[PDB]
Design a protein around this nucleic acid. Structure first.
Lengths: 76, 94, 104, 78, 98, 93, 104, 98, 80
DNA sequence: ACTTACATGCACAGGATGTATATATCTGACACGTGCCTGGAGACTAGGGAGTAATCCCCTTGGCGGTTAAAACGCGGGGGACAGCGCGTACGTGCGTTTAAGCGGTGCTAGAGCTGTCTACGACCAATTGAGCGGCCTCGGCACCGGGATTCTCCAGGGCGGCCAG
DNA sequence: ACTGGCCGCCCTGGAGAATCCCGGTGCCGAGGCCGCTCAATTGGTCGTAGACAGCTCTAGCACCGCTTAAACGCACGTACGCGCTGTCCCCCGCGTTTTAACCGCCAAGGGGATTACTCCCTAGTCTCCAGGCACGTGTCAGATATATACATCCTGTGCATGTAAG
């Protein structure tokens, strides 16, 4: 029950903190979030779920792959 | 008329020494009968070649034991040699 | 008079085995100890299977040994399984074995 | 008639082998492997039959054949 | 309705047939198969009843063991479904390809 | 000290199929082991064949049947031809 | 006149006949048995010597070596089956690299 | 410096040894292995030179063949690297499991 | 007592190469030493059994050949 | 701030099903009777294979020494093993339908089994010698070692095309 | 917007390093000769088991009728199998360094292949019973059926973190 902002804010924070062509993958973001925040045991599921919903909104844009297994970037 | 000899009666005798209150089905006795004949042919065949190989014309206890050592795995062989030696010794004492 | 079987303390026929060797085209001569030693080894393996088969029969609340028991006895015995690795027992069936990864 | 050895018969054998899931292509392959197996054994069996100058294949012929191929069978004599 | 799950009945069958010892192939269809194959060796062959049984006993025993090996091959490839490629590998190591 | 072998016979045969080709002793050994092997293989089966049918004579029939059992496919067909041939030619001189 | 020549064979009919008598196979040996056997032995010997000779020539050699025997046999479908459980000393193996291991 | 690529030199080795027939195990070390193992059956055993050589031929032929079968098991599992699991599967179907 | 390690990794690699093997796990090498050991134990055992039968103290080549044959591994080029 | 929804885990209700339980009964496979035929003794002979001590001497073990091929250790970075996710879909479970297996009785005989013939083929001892084995020279196919020449792998150094980053 | 930079991709020559191939040359094992044994061959004796004709009858195909049980066809829904992707480190390739296998060498003696002398085991034969077979009859371990107590599988409900809607 530790403090932590939403997953949308964390992922966006993790992607933008990482200067990179292919934005970021799911694995990259997960290890960033784990060390830069107090996150629970279900980080991975919530990260997985958040990318799923941000892609469909068009908040997150896709780079390589298709779906939660890939590399992605933020839209402008 | 027809006469077919067998190991049936001897296999049954052995069964009673090991499990006096247990019986055996016909098909099982056939299997047991095939197994004894099998082992007989196997061991004797190897002993036969052993005699040939070493240019001897007699199959003695020595060849049979060596044939046993070659064909039976691990502990099986050891006890088989023990039993073999036991029987031959007692038979020689008479 | 004493039966040659009894002299060696055997249930198996030293007499029959001795003859089978002579008429079996194995050698010109058969030593006196040869049939006794072989008969002894044959009786042991028979007894060995029977003790295990007996147990197998007992383990299913049965007093009569059937092919299935002979199978269970041999395949559950390390030394017998190797000795009979190329033999197939009719109506013997197969030993119960389900691989771990298929279990729920 | 080789199509006679059917799926439900094949699938029981697989179950006894411990198989849990079976590809549909397995069934024809099994019919083929079995034919081959039978061809080899029956071939040797008949070869024994002809040597004895017989027109009837006896059980011993089949037993001797199986033994020749290292697949000895108990419970038929031999 | 009651419908279980795929594999449940499957596993039940495995446990079942591994416990029993009856022949799993239909006697008569198989007996016809034997004679047909036999046709290619000698014309008008006769068969002892026991000869056909000895063949069926040997045939099922061969296939059953083969499925055991086929299973290990499938599992080795991280699968639970035996496939043609599984039978081929098992038989190849064993010998007598095709 | 004298040990016999198929050494001399294998060479005569080699010279019939390929007259300008020789064979190393190690290769000859392998060939000698092979012929001796085949001899033992065929004879054991013929022995068993004679036994199964309660006969005490090894005839050309046991040898032939043995070949049909031991040798694969076309090899047997040509082997049986030669065996037949040999026996005929021998029995006519 | 040698017995070998009467059957038109290279292999020793006489030696095979003797080996049969002193080999513990049967009480008696037929007259045609050694002849039939020697012919079969000769044929198989010829068959391999034929394939081997071709094999040595293909590697530009006139003298046969173990390697040529191994190549000759394993490339001949029928001989390979016949010698499926034999190992030829200093024979090596046939070049066979599995497709997926190759680069592209 | 010149360094090729992983696997390139390996294929070159593969082709090389499949072309030759010489023994691949050190002669003397193998011989010592034989006598030590022989100790556990009979003490002060003597060996013919030709006997030890016959053993090395058989031994290397056995292993070489095992690796071919092993390799097929690996590839089956969609790998190109043989692993202990691969050898165990090969030998299991082969017999002599224990 | 540690001479089983004399069948070195390089030596094990070449054999695998002849077997057509391209990549080898490090765990292969010890397991390989073990299989070979078992193999030798089985063969030597039968070989010595032949030696004792002939009432000899020395193992001859034929003993090994017969031993291998007994185990369904016939060998050509040493006799028989 | 509260309520709703996934998506996960997990307890546990649940009847619904399949397992194994006990007791009553029936069916027929097996273990034990009897006469009856054939091998297993029992006793003894003679021929010779196998046990014996003792003979060469072949071949294993043993030691040494220098050369150096080969095993060992370390060291990077790449190509692989492996975990995860999304997708298509073959495989399973289940019920309703269809086919032929399985079971029974019975006729009719091809063929396996057995007996009894006696002709012919194979062990048997003996005698003669030439086929085939154990040394003994050469010499040429082949192993050994030198210099070109062909093939293959690769990593830079471009030029084409993708898209933040600004 | 637009630019600018970095980062991809495909191929495209040459430098680096193996492999095939040509060449001359040292040489040890293959091929042939030819001595001398002992195994093969011709010649005839027997003695039997295999060839062969005749028989009885166990057993195989073969047809028919019959229920049901096993196959089979069909259709849903799931979870398993293949593909793609991304990361970590295990395996590779390489150069130095250190081990010791390898070779060529000489030297001592276990024990292997072979010798005669001869004892002691084994095959061969006639001769009586009895052990082991085929042959039967009756108890009973096993199979079955219905009742039912126990064990297994599977949904459906509640519930910490989350994320939206108000």
């Amino acid at each position: 029950s530790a403090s932590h902002p939403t997953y949308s804010e964390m992922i966006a924070a993790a992607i933008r903190a990482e200067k990179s062509r292919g934005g970021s993958s799911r694995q990259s973001i997960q290890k960033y979030i784990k060390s830069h925040y107090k996150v629970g045991h279900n980080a991975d599921l919530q990260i997985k779920l958040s990318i799923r919903r941000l892609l469909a909104a068009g908040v997150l844009k896709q780079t390589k792959g298709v779906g939660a297994s890939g590399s992605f970037r933020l839209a402008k | 008329r027809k006469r077919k000899e067998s190991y049936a009666i001897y296999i049954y005798k052995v069964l009673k020494q090991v499990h006096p209150d247990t019986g055996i089905s016909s098909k099982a006795m056939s299997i047991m009968n095939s197994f004894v004949n099998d082992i007989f042919e196997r061991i004797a065949a190897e002993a036969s070649r052993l005699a040939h190989y070493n240019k001897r014309s007699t199959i003695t206890s020595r060849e049979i034991q060596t044939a046993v050592r070659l064909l039976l795995p691990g502990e099986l062989a050891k006890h088989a040699v023990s039993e073999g030696t036991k029987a031959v010794t007692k038979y020689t004492s008479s | 008079a004493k039966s040659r079987s009894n002299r060696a303390g055997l249930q198996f026929p030293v007499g029959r085995i001795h003859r089978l060797l002579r008429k079996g085209n194995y050698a010109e001569r058969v030593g006196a100890g040869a049939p006794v030693y072989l008969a002894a080894v044959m009786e042991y393996l028979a007894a060995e299977v029977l003790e295990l088969a007996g147990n197998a029969a007992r383990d299913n609340k049965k007093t009569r040994i059937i092919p299935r028991h002979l199978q269970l006895a041999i395949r559950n015995d390390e030394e017998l399984n190797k000795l009979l690795s190329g033999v197939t027992i009719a109506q013997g069936g197969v030993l119960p074995n389900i691989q771990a990864v298929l279990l729920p | 008639n080789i199509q006679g050895i059917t799926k439900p018969a094949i699938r029981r054998l697989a179950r006894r082998g411990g198989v849990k899931r079976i590809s549909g292509l397995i069934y024809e392959e099994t019919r083929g492997v079995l034919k081959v197996f039978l061809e080899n054994v029956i071939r040797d069996a008949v070869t024994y039959t002809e040597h004895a100058k017989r027109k009837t294949v006896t059980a011993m012929d089949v037993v001797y054949a199986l033994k020749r191929q290292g697949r000895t069978l108990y419970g038929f004599g031999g | 309705p009651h419908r279980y799950r795929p594999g449940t009945v499957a596993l039940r069958e495995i446990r079942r047939y591994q416990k029993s010892t009856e022949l799993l192939i239909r006697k008569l269809p198989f007996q016809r198969l034997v004679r047909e194959i036999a046709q290619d060796f000698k014309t008008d062959l006769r068969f002892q009843s026991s000869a056909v049984m000895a063949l069926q006993e040997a045939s099922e025993a061969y296939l059953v063991g083969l499925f055991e090996d086929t299973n290990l091959c499938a599992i080795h490839a991280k699968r639970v479904t035996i496939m043609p490629k599984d039978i081929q590998l098992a038989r190849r190591i064993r010998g007598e390809r095709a």
